[PDB]
């Protein structure tokens, strides 16, 4: 259970009861004039908990920009060998929706002892309440991007400062697999022998 707050994300690895339509409710306390977050609109029970952690907020704003950034935010989640590691990034994007041609390098945030297999999930939300107008819900608009990982061999080009720009998949096309043989992003004019192929049995 990853919960971002105003401002201490309290990562949680526990045993919960997640509702049929889980998401974080947000309301107005009237005491100290602060917008709290009701966290049990996500899940009813919190008990048995195995792990807990807190860090500086992964989700972060900048704004003042009237757009032209959109603050494109990416998070990679990979669960292996007892370490489920989180990755992040923040990028400006001027395009209406979809992604540019640029490379996005994601550093590992925390490498945590998770030890559980995660086969399924859903995201979380922040909504609020409104008052009499012709209850209020679905603040603004929400959309995001999801894709699944896969084992692949990449050639990684670090920079003088170690900032990876160009990465190339080997299996992407018969052309991409040869660049992994020369290890170079420059491919000199000529013929190169990429890995062999076999006909397979019916």
């Amino acid at each position, epitope marked *: 259970l990853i919960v971002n707050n105003a401002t201490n994300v309290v990562i949680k690895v526990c045993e919960f009861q997640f509702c049929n339509d889980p998401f974080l409710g947000v309301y107005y*306390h*009237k005491n100290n004039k602060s917008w709290m977050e009701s966290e049990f609109r996500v899940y009813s029970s919190a008990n048995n908990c195995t792990f807990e952690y807190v860090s500086q907020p992964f989700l972060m704003d900048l704004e003042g920009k009237q757009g032209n950034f959109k603050n494109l935010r990416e998070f990679v989640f990979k669960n292996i060998d007892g370490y489920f590691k989180i990755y992040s990034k923040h990028t400006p994007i001027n395009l209406v929706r979809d992604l540019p041609q640029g490379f996005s390098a994601l550093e590992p945030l925390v490498d945590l002892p998770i030890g559980i297999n995660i086969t399924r999930f859903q995201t979380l939300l922040a909504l609020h309440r409104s008052y*009499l107008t*012709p*209850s209020g819900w679905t603040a603004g608009a929400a959309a995001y991007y999801v894709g699944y990982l896969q084992p692949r061999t990449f050639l990684l080009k670090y920079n003088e400062n170690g900032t990876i720009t160009d990465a190339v998949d080997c299996a992407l096309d018969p052309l991409s697999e040869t660049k992994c043989t020369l290890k170079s992003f420059t491919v000199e004019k000529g013929i190169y022998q990429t890995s062999n192929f076999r006909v397979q049995p019916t």
Partner: antibody
Amino acid sequence: EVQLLEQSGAEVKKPGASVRVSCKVSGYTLPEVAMHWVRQAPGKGLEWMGGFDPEDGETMYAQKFQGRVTMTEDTSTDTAYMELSSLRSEDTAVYYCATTTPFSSSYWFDPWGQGTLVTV
Amino acid sequence: SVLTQAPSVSAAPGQKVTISCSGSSSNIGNNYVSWYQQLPGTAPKLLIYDNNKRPSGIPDRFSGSKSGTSATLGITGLQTGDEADYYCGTWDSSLSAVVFGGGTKLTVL
């Protein structure tokens, strides 16, 4: 949107008593929205009472009736108790649970509590 | 209470006639006005808020206006079920509270 719970129920208290009024809600949580109270005497008009102040954050008390009636709040159980004291002649009447919205300037009392008469 | 409106008013059905409430600058002048309806022994229902705004479920046939210290509640398309008392209110900074008028019980003739 929202329906409420009743204001009291039927509370009949002979002279020499005093009565709390516990108004609960449904579909909202208690301290996202402010309550209010109005005296309504049958065959008569409205007299506002109790109430919360969007400004200054205080829970208001009608100056005319100030000090005789008090209010407390239990946020989780949504129970807001209106205790009126020192029964008098004309003070038996329907006292409505009403609500405004902390955002922002709302004077209007919004879905309300069906009414409860008291007894002196 | 501290405001001005008559006990009762009467008109023929299906007609167009309104009801007004006379306040002061200390009450209606700087503040927004609301209007309420109650049937005998029933739950007083919000009619119009800020005099220009209809709550959910209100016939559009109702309107409102604020001229100086005077606030009229637009009442049109009279119905046989429209007989009831209408109450004016607006925020008061004088006693710093909520005020109302005595109420005006309409009668559809």
